[PDB]
């Protein structure tokens, strides 16, 4: 029976491949060739944030485009005021091996975790004025690689056990498990309407998940190695991924096909992080060469670079409004560009 | 009237920065160690004689050591291995001797040592269960490592009294198998410190201490162009 089920799976895979070929009338590169290029982009560092001692693994912008949360390997989260560069909080962690963090859209909570397989949720707004742990979420058996906030009572996490999960923060119980990956899950991204999310994994694939049903709606392939970063397009009908093969790819959720490849002969390093600008025209990615390249998302041309790091770039993000891009690296510094 | 809020933020930084300075001193004086080993490794004994991650703290001669043991993580090491790229040392425990467990250990060590992020991290290597190797050999290596048939005891070998020369050859053969990998790939940035220990031995606590010292000393000697 096993050989026949395998043959059936191969037949379905071939049917899917032909179904996708049937829609491949033209590539993106044959349409946007009539669009003027963005030209040279020269961003400059405006502010530098100092205080972490260990390599910084995660950074996330809040919804007011004014506060940042960052996490280093020391066991400390720092809340920063990007405008005045002043610190707001410095939260000690139970363990130093923190790999991800997230800022709640309400500004009330901060989530983080990593090798302890526990997602810790801190309440930043308490009557005593002291930051306290409000919840510890546990169930995941592998390391925690990414956390995202849907609402104050709902959080989406991913772990190294190939399973994503939706947690009910107030009750502390896991409510939805998303399975089907075979490698570690590296990065999550939520849809603008937070009904769908996409999960990239160390399988050279990504999956489009239905937040409400618990069903995996689409599976995307195309990368040659492990996927390290994923980011939804501003419109919500496409996402960009980065992998260890030194290529970045844009996928279309409505055509279930790869749409564009971003690569260069001189780039042989993986892509630690991927992010889009407010208009979706610029794609930014951090590399292992201690820099960041800004790509024209509609042309696959390089628009410019962000150089100012001496160690691996670990994270990148853009403000909701679009006024600034912030990055972090293993140098224990955060920088803001303009 | 907005100056009152700005003043308040300055006060917060003063409180935070002073605490960070205190914490920074504690951070630099603490030596972090990563503990890895074979599935049959006596890793528990390694801990006793000294979730997804466990922490053990030691104070050895007024020096604070922090050892992290990998808990219930997936067998795929290539992603969390990068995180431990700034520890003082990696302690790798291999049991000598059903698959060819030694080849797996040698396979793993080769992969670790040549990792692009671990090029400056030294490895302290413990070879455990010496009595099982000794009994197996005196009671086979050539069926797994044919070159052992032509191996001779190093001229600088210092075996304990009472050891069977066949056992001493097996121990040095295995040690040399690890050392050839370390020597061939190393470029003076990090070193391997192999040791031959017993399953139960409290002396291991000083072996790590002394090795950590030498690692740091040679690091500084490299910096000052003396070594």
């Amino acid at each position, epitope marked *: 029976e096993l050989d026949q089920l395998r043959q059936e799976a191969e037949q379905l895979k071939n049917q899917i491949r032909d179904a996708r070929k049937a829609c491949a009338d033209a590539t993106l590169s044959q349409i946007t060739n009539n669009i003027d290029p963005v030209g040279r982009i020269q961003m400059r560092t405006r502010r530098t944030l100092r205080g972490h001692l260990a390599k910084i693994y995660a950074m996330h912008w809040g919804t007011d485009s004014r506060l940042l949360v960052s996490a280093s390997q020391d066991g400390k989260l720092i809340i920063w005021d990007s405008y005045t560069t002043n610190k707001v909080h410095a939260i000690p962690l139970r363990s130093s091996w923190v790999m991800t963090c997230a800022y709640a859209p309400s500004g009330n909570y901060v989530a983080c975790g990593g090798l302890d397989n526990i997602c810790s949720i801190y309440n930043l707004k308490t009557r005593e004025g002291n930051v306290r742990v409000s919840r510890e979420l546990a169930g995941h058996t592998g390391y925690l690689s990414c956390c995202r906030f849907l609402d104050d009572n709902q959080i989406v996490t991913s772990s190294g056990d190939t399973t994503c999960a939706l947690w009910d923060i107030e009750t502390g119980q896991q409510t939805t498990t998303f399975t089907g990956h075979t490698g570690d899950v590296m990065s999550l991204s939520l849809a603008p309407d937070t009904r769908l999310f996409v999960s990239g994994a160390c399988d050279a694939s990504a999956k489009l998940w239905d937040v409400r049903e618990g069903m995996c709606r689409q599976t995307f*392939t195309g990368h*040659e*190695s492990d996927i390290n970063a994923i980011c939804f397009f501003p419109n919500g009908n496409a996402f960009a991924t980065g992998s260890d093969d030194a290529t970045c790819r844009l996928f279309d959720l409505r055509a279930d096909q790869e749409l564009m490849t971003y690569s260069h002969d001189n780039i042989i390093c993986g892509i630690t992080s991927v992010s889009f600008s407010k208009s979706g025209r610029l794609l930014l990615a951090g590399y292992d060469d201690f820099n960041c390249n800004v790509w024209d998302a509609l042309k696959a041309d390089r628009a410019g670079v962000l150089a100012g790091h001496d160690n691996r770039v670990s994270c990148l993000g853009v403000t909701d409004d679009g006024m600034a891009v912030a990055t972090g690296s293993w140098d224990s510094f955060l920088k803001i560009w303009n | 009237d907005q100056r009152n809020e700005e003043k308040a933020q300055r006060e917060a930084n003063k409180k935070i920065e002073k605490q960070l300075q205190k914490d920074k001193q504690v951070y630099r004086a603490t030596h972090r160690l990563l503990l890895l080993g074979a599935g049959e490794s006596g890793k528990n004994t390694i801990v006793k004689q000294m979730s997804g991650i466990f922490e053990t703290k030691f104070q050895v001669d007024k020096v604070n050591f922090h050892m992290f043991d990998v808990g219930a993580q997936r067998d795929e090491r290539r992603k969390w291995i990068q995180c431990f790229n700034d520890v003082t040392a990696i302690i790798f425990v291999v049991a000598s001797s059903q698959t060819n467990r030694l080849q797996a250990a040698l396979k793993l060590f080769d992969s670790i040592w040549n990792n692009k992020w671990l090029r400056d991290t030294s490895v302290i290597l413990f070879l455990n269960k010496q009595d099982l190797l000794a009994e197996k050999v005196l009671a086979k290596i050539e069926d797994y490592f044919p070159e052992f048939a032509r191996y001779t005891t190093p001229e600088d070998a210092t075996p304990e009294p009472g050891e069977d020369p066949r056992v001493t050859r097996a121990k040095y053969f295995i040690r040399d198998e690890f050392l050839r990998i370390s020597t061939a790939s190393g470029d003076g940035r990090h070193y391997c410190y192999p040791h031959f220990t017993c399953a139960v031995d409290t002396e291991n606590i000083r072996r790590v201490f002394n090795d950590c010292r030498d690692i740091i000393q040679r690091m500084h000697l490299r910096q000052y162009e003396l070594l």
Partner: nanobody
Amino acid sequence: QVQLQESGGGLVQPGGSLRLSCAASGFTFSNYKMNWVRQAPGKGLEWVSDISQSGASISYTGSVKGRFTISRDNAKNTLYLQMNSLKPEDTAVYYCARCPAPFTRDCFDVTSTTYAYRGQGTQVTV
């Protein structure tokens, strides 16, 4: 999507030989190190051979030295294995496996848990 499909298996008598193959797709073959691993009927996966991207450096487990050889052809994306002087001890399912990243020399591909860049394997009964 990347695939590895083994071939050239079968049953042979002691002292005989086989030539195994492995077709790769979905990635640039010449940029990756390739390995052969075996699954023993009652034992966990064991590494057998490791060939570098250029074919300049080939490593074998000690138990197969002088009996097994490997090669690759980057113009065909094909990895081979010559299995000579076989003994009952060599009965196993053989898998062709790829190192997780290009342009590197560190590999973790004999994991018990489902490995993403491993083929289905071919049974070599002796």
